[PDB]
Amino acid sequence: AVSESQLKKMVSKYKYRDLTVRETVNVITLYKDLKPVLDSYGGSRELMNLTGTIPVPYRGNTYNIPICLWLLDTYPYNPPICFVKPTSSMTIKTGKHVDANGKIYLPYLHEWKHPQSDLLGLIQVMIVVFGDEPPVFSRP
Amino acid sequence: PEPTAPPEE
């Protein structure tokens, strides 16, 4: 697992460090398949993101939907940039909440406002919305 | 956990 000490190091360049670490811990504690990763966003600059899967029930079954939540250095004042990350055995379902690049669009992200908006609330919304319209489907 | 997705409909 990851420690708060290691997280603080990862967000050293962030404007609101304690707040970002606090929510990250909350998220990875509840969602065991999400992992904090420090990587180059779009190959432009380094940012920490939460990568992995979240459990989403659809038509009676639960799926481990692969996602990636990029936390900007302005987190939590600005919402995260989120993507669905299909494996080779699946395809991105472009639609109301997902564009051609797998980027996620949600009213929750659009009107994001700290402190009423947070990652736990966002993920809860994803589970509900994706449970209605999956962002990815498996190849036949 | 391994990434999974519902079958194409």
Curated annotation (Swiss-Prot), chain A:
It comes from the Eukaryota. It is found in: Cytoplasm; Early endosome membrane; Late endosome membrane; Cytoplasm, Cytoskeleton, Microtubule organizing center, Centrosome. Changing V84A: No change in interaction with p6; no effect on HIV-1 budding. Heart, brain, placenta, lung, liver, skeletal, kidney and pancreas. Transmembrane segments: none annotated. Component of the ESCRT-I complex, a regulator of vesicular trafficking process. Binds to ubiquitinated cargo proteins and is required for the sorting of endocytic ubiquitinated cargos into multivesicular bodies (MVBs). Mediates the association between the ESCRT-0 and ESCRT-I complex. Required for completion of cytokinesis; the function requires CEP55. May be involved in cell growth and differentiation. Acts as a negative growth regulator. Involved in the budding of many viruses through an interaction with viral proteins that contain a late-budding motif P-[ST]-A-P. Belongs to the ubiquitin-conjugating enzyme family. UEV subfamily. This is Tumor susceptibility gene 101 protein. The gene is TSG101. The chain holds residues 2 to 145 of 390 of the full protein.
